[PDB]
Design a binder for this molecule. Structure first.
Ligand SMILES: [Cl-]
Ligand SMILES: [Cl-]
Lengths: 247, 262
């Protein structure tokens, strides 16, 4: 779990998107990593390590892997799976896409979230800005456990701060909409405060142009007023794979 | 005047700052070194953003990191700011070497900036060494005021908090009462950061234990590099009662006096 920073080589400052930057390195001369800093005094060294251990046991191909941590200097740093094509949101906006590729992106994320659901691990901030794309165009979920969102939040979260797997389900629906809208911001004609109000009164996202009726049904199933009547990530993955068979 | 065309940006580079930090550098109109920072998307209206950017651009002082402009015509919004070669003050304190006269000079720089902000009734709200930058001449300037809604690549527990408890006075922790006097408190802690050469305040306390400690009347210890007079100044910032804390004008007077007494 602990990392010696002398096992890091080929340290670089890379560009991502137009103005973004990433600290790149090689870990043990095999793994491409991004190096991220932990905010000082934001948690105990105890709390940090236990959370890092939970996160490192979360192993799935469509989760951005945490390879380890370094706590022997200030600030603490983490090293994560390097993702060449960067943020999914930026990726949606730049490029090109066939509708099959969009549904593939939804499947990738749904697999990741199915896994997290199976581990009873809540993401709490699922969104396109929190997904990354590798060189092969595979989408992976990131910014879980350690993180840096009204428009991604269900009523029960906005009103009562009730987080559950079903609040992640809701966010996933909004992420599907982000993907199929090619990276539009949800509820873009509303402010954060207006969004919270209107959502409580039953506002929902429109069907994106590129989404079929079946695709819309799936993302819309995520936005049921009652949390318990929203599907699971397993069900969603089934629904997505069925639509792939048909489309 | 406030709006920027990104085609006026040249010599775009990705620079290192500290061990693992990164900065997006550019030239604006071939006569300004700038850092390019992105704004967190949908954190405010385009109305709210622009009015705040205008307030910030009218804040002109040599020891404030200048905001040169904004670009709102693409997603995300970005801002361009005065480039500061020697980077974050906290990292700067930890690397280097320092004479005690240089440490007090750093405090003066910041106090000048804060005196100016106080004169404009503009609250910083998050004054700390991590929010000060150092230029090529070794001059310290205050940054991350107004727009702190900048995209940050620093991580925390999604259960934990990112609120700066260790820089906050009782009335902020208890009642969220921000004033110039809560900035005064933070300035005291920044002085301690400077004179401790970049230690974290209350290192062996949690945020909750820190709040308890202050409530008992206890304060950050005198760093060995601080004189009695220097400690008196930073300590004056931590009065339990906000109204009995000094102003930035008073602090600047106190600092300049101590400089005279070489
Ligand atoms: Cl590479
Ligand atoms: Cl659309």
């Amino acid at each position: 779990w602990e990392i010696d920073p002398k096992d890091l080589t080929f340290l670089k400052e890379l560009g991502t998107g137009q103005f973004g930057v990433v600290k790149y390195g090689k870990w043990r001369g095999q793994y491409d990593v991004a190096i991220k800093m932990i905010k000082e005094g934001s948690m105990s060294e105890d709390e940090f390590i236990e959370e890092a251990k939970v996160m490192m046991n979360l192993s799935h191909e469509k989760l951005v892997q945490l390879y380890g941590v370094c706590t022997k200097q200030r600030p603490i740093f983490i090293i994560t799976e390097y993702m060449a094509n960067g943020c999914l949101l930026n990726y949606l906006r730049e490029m090109r896409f066939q509708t099959q590729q969009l549904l593939e992106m939804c499947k990738d994320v749904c697999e990741a979230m199915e896994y997290l659901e199976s581990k009873q691990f809540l993401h709490r901030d699922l969104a396109a800005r929190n997904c990354l794309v590798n060189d092969q165009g595979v989408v992976k979920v990131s910014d879980f456990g350690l993180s840096r969102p009204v428009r991604w939040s269900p009523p029960e979260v906005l009103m009562y701060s009730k987080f559950s797997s079903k609040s992640d389900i809701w966010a996933f629906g909004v992420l599907m909409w982000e993907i199929y809208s090619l990276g539009k911001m949800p509820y873009e004609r509303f402010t954060n405060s207006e969004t919270a109000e209107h959502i409580a009164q039953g506002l929902r996202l429109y069907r994106p142009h590129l989404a079929s009726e079946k695709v819309y049904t799936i993302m819309y199933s995520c936005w049921h007023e009652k949390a318990d009547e929203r599907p699971t990530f397993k069900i969603l993955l089934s629904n997505i794979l069925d639509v792939m068979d048909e489309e």
